[PDB]
């Protein structure tokens, strides 16, 4: 038969390995010829695998590249202006790749040009609370200083935003061994650790969902009208550059001024971690000078879009998407995900050649320019937003399949919790010691839910990946899954470095490609069920449970300020009422879904439309404050860390640091406004599940 | 059988007459007890007529009322400050109503309080071009002056906005006999003309679609958080009051300064129509003083919502809605429409009692507080926006059924043109001389299309009525129809006056209620077809024809500036390309709609969803510039006259008066941006009609 078991059994570890090798021999940087050639290859292969149509969708978007004849670097300069120490111009290439052409040197994409010179302030992870500690407690002024921050904990674009608002004139980002060197493991090529010359690339935008900085709201097609640079979205105002820990040690060792305020400020290098400003007395006249010469450039990018037309509901789309562009070789990021998508397409195509079609249409996507700010997925969704909002059932992401080899990680909408528990109970665990047991059993054992016994942890969707437009802008139920470590926002040690190669994966992460196969089964199995189940596999009651958890959470935050809640009459009663109503209505809808006349395809589709439009109901067309492309009222990326999800984000940001606002009546008024918007949106989403007439 | 003929034959002129009499014996001002009682009566009657459910939906919204113990009036004051002339405190009540309680005196709803005193400038109709003529050509400065403007031509809220921006400190609105006294007809009670003591009530907001001024975006429910007055939407900044032509003559007769610039500035009173400022030499020391004491007040309003559940597609809604609140008796506005809705409900209920149900759900609405800014319809749509955007098939409005007795008037989306031509060919003409001929024949003969021989005129939807939220905010296909005169934006002579009574209609407009019956057949027949036709009765090819007409029109406007189009490379090629593509794709969709396997209900509903979501595709979630609740890219209310529709409004407003902008590069850049947005939206709407996979 053609059922999910036939699909899953066709997936092969050895195929995923072959595809990964094939995708990682040369760099595939967005906007380069090599990445266009790989796009054409995937288009051709998906056609041969049997998809109905496979097209390239191109856009011309703002990208950023170093200047090949005017390299970026940082110096220590003495009082005469001689450069006595320079940081590296490139990472030492790994064995056997020392002659590979077109490895982009480490840089921070979208940095402006400049050569600022000044004194160093060390700002730990450059988090909002790190800057609070510096200004408010230690009384250190970052204005006109160059800040040096360690990578880790939060998205680097938030670090740069925080440094700008502190008045910094430049930012140096570096990888501390505390965060990127696991104890007892060797440096690449002899293990999976970051060597001292390794450096993490990455963009430093603050797009808040906008996509291409020059075309917010509309696809960057041939006739698009572009903002000028000065009005672009999300560009940093100060120069930024990343370095490795050999170079950081040279910048940090001479630091003077104030001692670190506590041990959470100290990394693992043999330096004091002094906050500064500037260097100890002997070197007090030396300064640090950046030299950044990168350029922003409108450049063509290419998404591959494959279609497998549905047999019964061709106007309902289940999307499996992940990116193709990499910083260098992309051994983990993204090609361990792209190889998994390739094998899933191949498997679905095998069934199609034998005469099967899924019930609903499946769309497969290979996105471009993700590393430069989710640009390819966002421009495509801008072009196709009307089709997606009326027809989009679900989006399953497919970036890196592995970030470790310990257990499964799933982040998704509550609407998919039941689907994921049920599927993982049917899959075999690949873990040592769990031979013959389910993936559900190994996952629940290694990653227990903090809330429920005998359940696994499933996280909120945050951002920093290509589901953002589909979930937080358009309100399409979304999910992601990968194998993970036992620190989740800092990246694995060789993240975005030249050392992330096929050999890294084959030698140190997944020699038998069994974790890749398990992830292919989870992502593919989810797509299969979403595209084939007669009734969509969403359980609205799971949203009711989480809404109550998030309401309790945000109420608890507010209750730290009881005097103000009395003065300004701040009540959460309306939000709890809406959550209670959602719980009651979802329970009654679930009974009808179980009970309805199963011979009636209009009641079924009516009820399938109620399930599909439930995530859509949490969208507010006015967006969140000053972030028009984050429209979901229950979930947004954290305003302090794009990678993390925040619940009831409008109320959360209205309450954050509220005790510091100079006009408390205005600040608590805005808390009340956000409570009203959240209560109304929960009630309105509940009412979409009521009987329709 | 139960078919459209059974529905239409059940409608009775005599029933419409009985209901009109019943609805017009006492005033039904929004927010008053009498209007709540009428809402309860209609709820009870719709239940008895046989609807499945009938509920009141209430909201607490900002309304405005005069102060009963501190009356509004205008004076001429002499140099000592004695008030030598006062305008009336009330309209003389009509025969037999001189003892009716609670007639609200003439006032401009939402005027602020004040007692400004100054010199008079006469500004004709206070249109944008009238103010251009005064400032630019005649060099008259309105700053610190009281302006006097005649009603007519444009919505009075636009007149007040224009007067504010000219620096006026108050506005006096009056009815000139040129616009409100037809030659050879007697004044009320002896004919349908405005007497000299008659006055037009009406609000002077500039809401731009927002609804309740205090709650833009969200329903004004029990827990709503309200803007403060200073941040409310759309409130005027200067006092405003309306007067009749006996009083206007006293204010205008003493005017001096400049002569009227031409005859288009002169009305029909025996005065010079001097523009001012101020009075002729003998009276040069007299001034005009306003006394406005009205108050804005959050007040409860009540919509009645009736449901007739669909037999096959209960999750598809066809809405028939019109308002119930009136300024005084509402003999024409709205009760000639509300009586027609009442008879339509009664007829559908007769069929239902015999066992019939429509295919799709029909919703019937009696809206409140329309006269205060479309508040009841807009708050309800804000509450129910998710249901409406995913399920709303069409909205048919039902305000005044008559504004004359000459011929039919229809304004609607192009998607309903074919429906209207086909229905009116099946209906009998009620017109003298067309006995035995179709309504299509009489209408086409009396109101020929300016574009096509043998076709009738159908206008764009403008605004100033309760379809605005459904069409321009939410993108639901909408239409309206009424009997009309042979000046369409000024209102009939007794518009919004105490003289608009049952006797006005029964004696002078429609003694046999035949025009009311014809309008009931058109509105009811449209609802019937939309709710019962297997394939939705929309023709996408009609949108293609009009899009080309509007593209030619906006290109022609731009081509008045050939030098600038050369300098700034302003091309319309992308918009014509999108319109050509829409034409081709709509032609192919129409072939499939005719050809598809008619046994397949999923292809049918898939294709019905493509038809329903086509109007929805013209919505831009970012809205038009500075008007976030006007989201349709093809149609918006004119920025110069809310009642009129404008096509390609984003490009139109970017081009308007562009030769006066101080930075032409910036102004033509914004023209190009609006061309890009319009081209993209037309192409994206076209693509919703392509094969789905
Ligand atoms: C009305 O409908 C038509 C389709 O019938 C649309 O036509 C498209 O028009 C655009 C022009 O705006 C064409 O864009 C061009 O695409 C070329 C590559 O196309 C190939 O590859 C894609 C896969 O991604 C296929 O879809 C396609 O069939 C082709 O196989 C580019 O090479 C072109 O860019 C080059 O020329 C331009 C202009 O000189 C330069 O600015 C560039 O730098 C570059 O050198 C260009 O981008 C597109 O191919 C057409 N599609 C077709 C025929 O299917 C219209 O766009 C549509 N109107 C609107 C308003 O949408
Ligand atoms: C969770 O779900 C429940 C329903 O199970 C919703 O309950 C509604 O709650 C509101 C309160 O916010 C109630 O509003 C009150 O309505 C009264 C009139 O109700 C009658 O008429 C309507 C027809 O319009 C019917 O729908 C209804 O069944 C009743 O027949 C008003 O008189 C009340 O106003 C008075 O009291 C308040 C508070 O003291 C004053 O501020 C006012 O000035 C006034 O004196 C009030 O507006 C509503 O009736 C409830 N509906 C029910 C039970 O069906 C919850 O609202 C919902 N939670 C959320 C967040 O939506
Ligand atoms: C994850 O798996 C769980 C466990 O299988 C699953 O929950 C189960 O769903 C089924 C529906 O397939 C439920 O079975 C129903 O139970 C009610 C009450 O006992 C019956 O009335 C239902 O009978 C109707 O429907 C049948 C078809 O399903 C017809 O044969 C019948 O004639 C009736 O029309 C029906 O049997 C079962 O109760 C739950 N078990 C639970 C909740 O413990 C869950 O749905 C899966 N999650 C997904 C798919 O997302
Ligand atoms: C307004 O009225 C006009 C005039 O009636 C109407 O246009 C007509 O619509 C009918 C569809 O009902 C068209 O008839 C079709 O013509 C094509 C080509 O000749 C045929 O292939 C079609 O046959 C298929 O469908 C039939 C059911 O309709 C089946 O019996 C058959 O087996 C095939 O499946 C079909 O007969 C007719 O051509 C037009 N006439 C025109 C455009 O002049 C218009 O639709 C009405 N507007 C509305 C309802 O909004
Ligand atoms: C990755 O695999 C692809 C597909 O097998 C290879 O591209 C093919 O290469 C052969 C030999 O040059 C050609 O005859 C085909 O036309 C290519 N097919 C396609 C679809 O492009 C490619 O060589 C492999 N890359 C690496 C680095 O091994
Ligand atoms: C760090 O790099 C800089 C730039 O290449 C070096 O300084 C240059 O040295 C050359 C040759 O002596 C001079 O002609 C240039 O004028 C210098 N440029 C600048 C900008 O100072 C510097 O020598 C390097 N420092 C170390 C320690 O290697
Ligand atoms: C308008 O018609 C309604 C409905 O016939 C009248 O209200 C009814 O009046 C009688 C007598 O007072 C009562 O017994 C009923 O309870 C009322 N019914 C409803 C549904 O309200 C009303 O009197 C009429 N109004 C006028 C001005 O004629
Ligand atoms: C117009 O109305 C005003 C206000 O009622 C009249 O002026 C008042 O006259 C009374 C009685 O003589 C005085 O006690 C008040 O002080 C006056 N009020 C003001 C504001 O001036 C005025 O007489 C009326 N004019 C005409 C021509 O009827
Ligand atoms: C390793 C995690 C924390 C981040 C990783 N995502 C990314 O690397 N995204 C890129 C682009 C993110 C964006 O621009 O939003 C970045 O963070 O530089 C992932 O989701 O696998
Ligand atoms: C008589 C026409 C021009 C206007 C009439 N509409 C109205 O009277 N609407 C009211 C409220 C309009 C609004 O606030 O937008 C008004 O114009 O004062 C109608 O559409 O029948
Ligand atoms: C890069 O640097 C070179 C050499 O200094 C210079 O000539 C050129 O202008 C720069 N290129 C770009 C693209 O800015
Ligand atoms: C930090 O330094 C700058 C200039 O040196 C100054 O303008 C700013 O107010 C300072 N902030 C403090 C002391 O908080
Ligand atoms: C793979 O698993 C083993 C066993 O737990 C572990 O020691 C090793 O660190 C893992 N490799 C990676 C890259 O995490
Ligand atoms: C209306 O005017 C009276 C009498 O001058 C005054 O006492 C009252 O304050 C006013 N009422 C309102 C509602 O403003
Ligand atoms: C109109 O008058 C006011 C003050 O009397 C002045 O500020 C304004 O600039 C004048 N405008 C002109 C003369 O255009
Ligand atoms: C009704 O129709 C007649 C005949 O054309 C016309 O003279 C009269 O003015 C009409 N009444 C109204 C109110 O227009
Ligand atoms: Ca864009
Ligand atoms: Ca509102
Ligand atoms: Cl992922
Ligand atoms: Cl109307
Ligand atoms: Zn990635
Ligand atoms: Zn990455
Ligand atoms: Zn009206
Ligand atoms: Zn009116």
Short mmCIF file of C-alpha atoms in Angstrom, two decimals, chain A residues 362-549:
data_model
loop_
_atom_site.label_atom_id
_atom_site.label_comp_id
_atom_site.label_asym_id
_atom_site.label_seq_id
_atom_site.Cartn_x
_atom_site.Cartn_y
_atom_site.Cartn_z
CA UNK A 362 2.80 19.79 -1.01
CA UNK A 363 5.18 22.66 -1.82
CA UNK A 364 8.92 22.15 -1.40
CA UNK A 365 11.26 25.12 -1.10
CA UNK A 366 15.03 25.69 -1.27
CA UNK A 367 15.32 29.28 0.01
CA UNK A 368 18.14 31.68 -0.82
CA UNK A 369 19.81 34.51 1.16
CA UNK A 370 18.57 33.21 4.50
CA UNK A 371 21.92 34.05 6.07
CA UNK A 372 21.42 37.70 5.09
CA UNK A 373 18.09 38.01 6.98
CA UNK A 374 15.56 35.36 5.88
CA UNK A 375 15.37 37.27 2.56
CA UNK A 376 14.38 34.55 0.06
CA UNK A 377 11.54 33.05 2.15
CA UNK A 378 10.24 36.51 3.09
CA UNK A 379 10.22 37.95 -0.47
CA UNK A 380 8.46 34.84 -1.77
CA UNK A 381 5.83 35.03 0.95
CA UNK A 382 5.37 38.75 0.19
CA UNK A 383 4.77 37.89 -3.46
CA UNK A 384 2.37 35.04 -2.62
CA UNK A 385 0.72 36.29 0.59
CA UNK A 386 -2.88 36.09 -0.72
CA UNK A 387 -2.47 32.49 -1.80
CA UNK A 388 -0.74 31.60 1.45
CA UNK A 389 -3.18 33.22 3.77
CA UNK A 390 -6.25 31.62 2.17
CA UNK A 391 -4.72 28.22 1.36
CA UNK A 392 -1.73 27.66 3.72
CA UNK A 393 -2.26 24.69 6.00
CA UNK A 394 1.18 24.42 7.59
CA UNK A 395 4.86 25.18 7.22
CA UNK A 396 7.58 22.74 8.34
CA UNK A 397 11.08 24.23 8.38
CA UNK A 398 14.22 22.30 7.38
CA UNK A 399 17.45 24.04 8.32
CA UNK A 400 20.28 22.13 10.11
CA UNK A 401 19.22 18.55 10.89
CA UNK A 402 21.78 18.29 13.69
CA UNK A 403 23.27 20.60 16.30
CA UNK A 404 24.33 17.70 18.49
CA UNK A 405 23.71 13.97 18.82
CA UNK A 406 21.94 13.72 22.20
CA UNK A 407 18.19 13.88 21.59
CA UNK A 408 15.34 15.33 19.49
CA UNK A 409 14.40 19.05 19.61
CA UNK A 410 10.97 20.21 18.41
CA UNK A 411 9.67 23.83 18.44
CA UNK A 412 6.17 24.34 17.08
CA UNK A 413 2.70 25.74 17.44
CA UNK A 414 0.54 24.05 20.13
CA UNK A 415 -1.71 22.95 17.21
CA UNK A 416 0.97 20.37 16.29
CA UNK A 417 1.77 18.95 19.75
CA UNK A 418 -0.55 15.92 19.36
CA UNK A 419 0.69 15.24 15.82
CA UNK A 420 4.31 15.23 17.09
CA UNK A 421 3.61 13.00 20.16
CA UNK A 422 1.72 10.51 17.92
CA UNK A 423 4.32 10.41 15.16
CA UNK A 424 7.33 10.04 17.47
CA UNK A 425 5.59 7.09 19.22
CA UNK A 426 5.63 5.26 15.81
CA UNK A 427 9.29 6.01 14.96
CA UNK A 428 12.33 3.99 16.16
CA UNK A 429 14.84 5.67 18.48
CA UNK A 430 18.34 5.93 16.94
CA UNK A 431 19.92 6.44 20.38
CA UNK A 432 22.41 4.05 22.02
CA UNK A 433 20.65 2.24 24.85
CA UNK A 434 17.18 2.68 23.31
CA UNK A 435 17.44 -0.05 20.67
CA UNK A 436 13.90 -1.32 20.02
CA UNK A 437 12.28 1.65 21.79
CA UNK A 438 10.32 4.56 20.25
CA UNK A 439 11.77 7.96 19.52
CA UNK A 440 9.02 9.26 21.87
CA UNK A 441 10.45 7.17 24.72
CA UNK A 442 14.11 8.29 24.23
CA UNK A 443 13.13 11.92 23.69
CA UNK A 444 10.83 12.08 26.77
CA UNK A 445 13.52 10.40 28.92
CA UNK A 446 16.34 12.81 27.78
CA UNK A 447 14.29 16.01 27.47
CA UNK A 448 11.42 15.88 29.97
CA UNK A 449 8.68 18.47 29.90
CA UNK A 450 9.12 20.94 32.82
CA UNK A 451 5.28 20.91 33.15
CA UNK A 452 4.07 17.29 32.65
CA UNK A 453 5.30 13.86 33.70
CA UNK A 454 5.77 11.36 30.88
CA UNK A 455 5.76 14.11 28.17
CA UNK A 456 8.74 15.59 26.23
CA UNK A 457 9.77 19.28 26.08
CA UNK A 458 8.43 21.19 23.05
CA UNK A 459 9.51 24.84 22.83
CA UNK A 460 7.87 27.95 21.47
CA UNK A 461 8.90 29.01 17.98
CA UNK A 462 11.27 31.91 18.26
CA UNK A 463 12.86 33.30 15.10
CA UNK A 464 16.17 33.49 13.26
CA UNK A 465 14.87 31.01 10.68
CA UNK A 466 12.68 30.83 7.58
CA UNK A 467 9.40 30.01 9.32
CA UNK A 468 9.22 33.63 10.63
CA UNK A 469 7.22 35.07 7.73
CA UNK A 470 4.81 32.15 7.63
CA UNK A 471 4.13 32.01 11.37
CA UNK A 472 4.56 35.51 12.86
CA UNK A 473 3.48 37.55 9.77
CA UNK A 474 0.93 35.35 8.05
CA UNK A 475 -0.33 33.05 10.92
CA UNK A 476 0.21 29.67 9.23
CA UNK A 477 0.73 26.79 11.75
CA UNK A 478 4.49 26.11 11.70
CA UNK A 479 7.01 23.64 13.22
CA UNK A 480 10.69 22.62 13.19
CA UNK A 481 12.66 19.55 14.44
CA UNK A 482 16.36 18.58 14.62
CA UNK A 483 18.74 16.53 16.69
CA UNK A 484 20.31 18.58 19.49
CA UNK A 485 22.81 18.75 22.44
CA UNK A 486 22.09 18.21 26.19
CA UNK A 487 23.20 27.54 25.67
CA UNK A 488 20.76 26.65 22.80
CA UNK A 489 20.98 30.20 21.30
CA UNK A 490 24.80 30.39 21.03
CA UNK A 491 25.21 27.82 18.24
CA UNK A 492 27.45 24.68 18.23
CA UNK A 493 31.19 25.43 18.34
CA UNK A 494 31.91 25.57 14.57
CA UNK A 495 28.72 27.50 13.72
CA UNK A 496 29.21 29.84 10.67
CA UNK A 497 32.92 29.06 10.47
CA UNK A 498 35.07 27.67 7.59
CA UNK A 499 35.43 24.49 9.73
CA UNK A 500 31.79 23.47 9.26
CA UNK A 501 32.42 20.84 6.60
CA UNK A 502 31.24 17.44 5.42
CA UNK A 503 34.08 15.88 7.47
CA UNK A 504 32.88 17.54 10.62
CA UNK A 505 29.53 15.78 10.24
CA UNK A 506 30.80 12.38 8.96
CA UNK A 507 33.60 12.10 11.57
CA UNK A 508 32.19 13.72 14.69
CA UNK A 509 28.41 14.24 14.61
CA UNK A 510 26.69 11.44 12.73
CA UNK A 511 28.95 8.81 11.12
CA UNK A 512 26.08 6.43 10.27
CA UNK A 513 23.66 9.23 9.26
CA UNK A 514 21.14 7.71 11.64
CA UNK A 515 20.30 11.05 13.33
CA UNK A 516 19.80 12.59 9.82
CA UNK A 517 17.48 9.68 8.97
CA UNK A 518 15.48 10.15 12.20
CA UNK A 519 15.09 13.89 11.44
CA UNK A 520 13.99 13.02 7.86
CA UNK A 521 11.36 10.71 9.36
CA UNK A 522 10.07 13.41 11.75
CA UNK A 523 9.95 16.27 9.18
CA UNK A 524 8.72 13.98 6.39
CA UNK A 525 6.19 12.19 8.63
CA UNK A 526 4.78 15.55 9.76
CA UNK A 527 4.41 16.69 6.11
CA UNK A 528 2.83 13.36 5.21
CA UNK A 529 0.18 13.55 7.94
CA UNK A 530 -0.58 17.24 7.29
CA UNK A 531 -0.97 16.61 3.57
CA UNK A 532 -2.88 13.28 3.83
CA UNK A 533 -5.00 13.07 6.96
CA UNK A 534 -8.69 13.41 6.18
CA UNK A 535 -9.22 15.69 9.18
CA UNK A 536 -6.26 18.10 9.64
CA UNK A 537 -4.05 16.76 12.50
CA UNK A 538 -4.39 19.89 14.75
CA UNK A 539 -5.77 19.78 18.30
CA UNK A 540 -7.23 23.14 19.32
CA UNK A 541 -7.45 22.03 22.99
CA UNK A 542 -3.64 22.13 23.20
CA UNK A 543 -3.77 25.87 22.42
CA UNK A 544 -6.24 26.32 25.27
CA UNK A 545 -3.80 24.74 27.79
CA UNK A 546 -0.88 26.91 26.72
CA UNK A 547 -2.96 30.13 26.63
CA UNK A 548 -3.73 29.59 30.30
CA UNK A 549 -0.04 29.01 31.11
#
